[PDB]
C-alpha cells in the first residue's frame, strides 16, 4: 500500500487536488496504523519547497508535484494533524510556514489567533490580528479588525495603545464599517477617558459617514451630547447639521431644533428655523412641515405671525410653480 | 481514528475540505459582543431615551430644571479627579486617624 501510494504520488496527475487527496489518504492510513508521526512526516515531505517558493498552482505548465506546496487543503490537514500531536512550537512553525507561502486566509489568521488564545497567549493573538490586518488591509480584515477590537476590549489594554489601535483601524476603513468603528471608539473614550474625546469622535463621524447613516449619526451625537452635557451644546452642531444633511434630513433636523428651542423657550429662533425649513421645502410637496409650522404658530405666534406664515407659504407656492 | 487527532477548526470533516465563512462565520463562536453586535443596542437605547424625553416634555407643561443641565459643569473632570483620588483619599483618612489617635494619646 505504501509502494502504491508512492507510485501514485510520483504519477503527474492533472489536478493538484487529486495529489493532495492521495497524500491525505496516505496520512489517514498511517494515522489508523498508529503512525501519526510518520503521517506528519509524509505530509511535511509532500508540502516541501524552498523558503521563497512562488510557483502558481493555477498555472498549467508545471507538474502537480511541483505545484503542491501552495495547497490549502494539504496545509490545513497538516496543521490539524500537528495541532493534536505536537506542542505550540511546532504549531507556530507550521503557521509561519503557511504565512511564508502567502496561502493563509482570514480564517487561517483567526484559527492562529484562537490557537494562541488557547495556549494562554494574548500578545501573540494581537500579533496574529496585526498580521491579518497588514496582509489584507481594506475589505478582507474589517471583520478581523472587529475581532481584534473585541480582543483588546477583553484584554483591558492601556488607553494610549487602545486609542492608537482604534485610530489605525479607522484610518482608511470604508464608511459602512467606519461608522461602527467610530461608535465603538466613542464608547471606549467615554468609558475610559474624558467625554471630550468621545464628542470629537462623534463630530469626526458626522463628517465621515455615509449619506444614509449621516442623519442617524447626527441624532446619536445629539443624544450623546444631551446625555453627557447640556442641550445647548447640540445647538450649533444641529446648525452644522443644517449645513451638512440632505434636504429631507435637514428638514427633520430643523424640525427637531425648532422643537428643542420651543422647549427651551427660544421662540424667535424656532420661528426662524421654521421659516428656513419652509424656504427649503415646497408647500405642496411638504404639507407636514407646513402643518407643524402652523401648529407651532398656534402654540407660539400672533395673528401678524400667522399672516407672515401665510405670506411665506404663498411665496413657497409661487417658487414651486 | 482519523477524526480524533484534529482540531476541527478550519477543516470540514464531512466535506473533506477547508471551512468557509460564508455559511459558518467564526463571529458566531465569540463569547462576547463583537463590533457588529455592538453599536446597535446603544443607538436603540439612545432612541428610547429621546422618545421618553419627548413624551415627558409633551406630558409636562413647564421646562424641567434638570433637563437642560442634567449634569453639573466639568462633570468629566470631577469624575477623573475622583478616580485619581483612590489611594490619596485613603492616605488622607489614615493621616486624620493618626492625628486623632495622637490627640487622644496627648489627652490621656
Amino acid at each position: 500500500a505504501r509502494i502504491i501510494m508512492e507510485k501514485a504520488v510520483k504519477v503527474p496527475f492533472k489536478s493538484v487536488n487529486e495529489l493532495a487527496d492521495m497524500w491525505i489518504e496516505w496520512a489517514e492510513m498511517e494515522l489508523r496504523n498508529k503512525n501519526f508521526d510518520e503521517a506528519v512526516r509524509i505530509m511535511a515531505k509532500a508540502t516541501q519547497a524552498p523558503k521563497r517558493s512562488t510557483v502558481d498552482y493555477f498555472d498549467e505548465s508545471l507538474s502537480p508535484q511541483q505545484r503542491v506546496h501552495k495547497s490549502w487543503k494539504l496545509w490545513s490537514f497538516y496543521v490539524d494533524l500537528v495541532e493534536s500531536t505536537s506542542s505550540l512550537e511546532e504549531t507556530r512553525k507550521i503557521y509561519e510556514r503557511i504565512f511564508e507561502l502567502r496561502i493563509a486566509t482570514p480564517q487561517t489568521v483567526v484559527n492562529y489567533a484562537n490557537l494562541l488564545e488557547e495556549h494562554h497567549y494574548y500578545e501573540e493573538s494581537f500579533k496574529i490580528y496585526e498580521r491579518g490586518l497588514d496582509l489584507f488591509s481594506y475589505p478582507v480584515a474589517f471583520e478581523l479588525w472587529n475581532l481584534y477590537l473585541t480582543k483588546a476590549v477583553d484584554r483591558k489594554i492601556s488607553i494610549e495603545r487602545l486609542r492608537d489601535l482604534f485610530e489605525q483601524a479607522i484610518t482608511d476603513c470604508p464608511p459602512k464599517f467606519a461608522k461602527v468603528l467610530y461608535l465603538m471608539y466613542g464608547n471606549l473614550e467615554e468609558e475610559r477617558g474624558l467625554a471630550r474625546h468621545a464628542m470629537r469622535i462623534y463630530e469626526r463621524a458626522t463628517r465621515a459617514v455615509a449619506d444614509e447613516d449621516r442623519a442617524d449619526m447626527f441624532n446619536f451625537y445629539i443624544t450623546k451630547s444631551a446625555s453627557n452635557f447640556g442641550l445647548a451644546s447640540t445647538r450649533p452642531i444641529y446648525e452644522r447639521a443644517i449645513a451638512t444633511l440632505p434636504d429631507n434630513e435637514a428638514r427633520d433636523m430643523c424640525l427637531k431644533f425648532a422643537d428643542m428651542e420651543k422647549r427651551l423657550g427660544e421662540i424667535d429662533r424656532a420661528r426662524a428655523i421654521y421659516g428656513h425649513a419652509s424656504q427649503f421645502c415646497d408647500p405642496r410637496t411638504n404639507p407636514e412641515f407646513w402643518a407643524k409650522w402652523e401648529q407651532f404658530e398656534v402654540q407660539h405666534g400672533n395673528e401678524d405671525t400667522f399672516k407672515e406664515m401665510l405670506r411665506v407659504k404663498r411665496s413657497v407656492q409661487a417658487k414651486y410653480n | 481514528p482519523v477524526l480524533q487527532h484534529l482540531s476541527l477548526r478550519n477543516y470540514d470533516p464531512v466535506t473533506r475540505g477547508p471551512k468557509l465563512g460564508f455559511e459558518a462565520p467564526p463571529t458566531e463562536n465569540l463569547n462576547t459582543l463583537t463590533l457588529e453586535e455592538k453599536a446597535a443596542a446603544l443607538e436603540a437605547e439612545a432612541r428610547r431615551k429621546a422618545q421618553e424625553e419627548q413624551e415627558a416634555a409633551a406630558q409636562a407643561r413647564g421646562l424641567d430644571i434638570t433637563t437642560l443641565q442634567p449634569k453639573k459643569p466639568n462633570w468629566d473632570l470631577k469624575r477623573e479627579f475622583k478616580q485619581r483620588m483612590a489611594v490619596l483619599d485613603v492616605r488622607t483618612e489614615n493621616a486624620i486617624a493618626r492625628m486623632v489617635r495622637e490627640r487622644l494619646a496627648e489627652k490621656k
Binding site: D268, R269, H276, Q279 | T66
Partner: peptide, 29 residues
C-alpha cells in the same frame, strides 16, 4: 441653498447659563 442670515437671539448662551443656574438653585432648594 442660499445662506440665510439668522438674527442674533434675544437670549444668549451666558443669559441661558444664569437662567439654568437659577433653575437648578430652585430645584435644589
Amino acid at each position: 441653498r442660499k445662506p440665510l442670515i439668522l438674527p442674533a437671539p434675544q437670549v444668549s448662551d451666558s443669559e441661558l447659563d444664569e437662567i439654568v443656574k437659577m433653575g437648578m438653585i430652585g430645584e435644589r432648594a
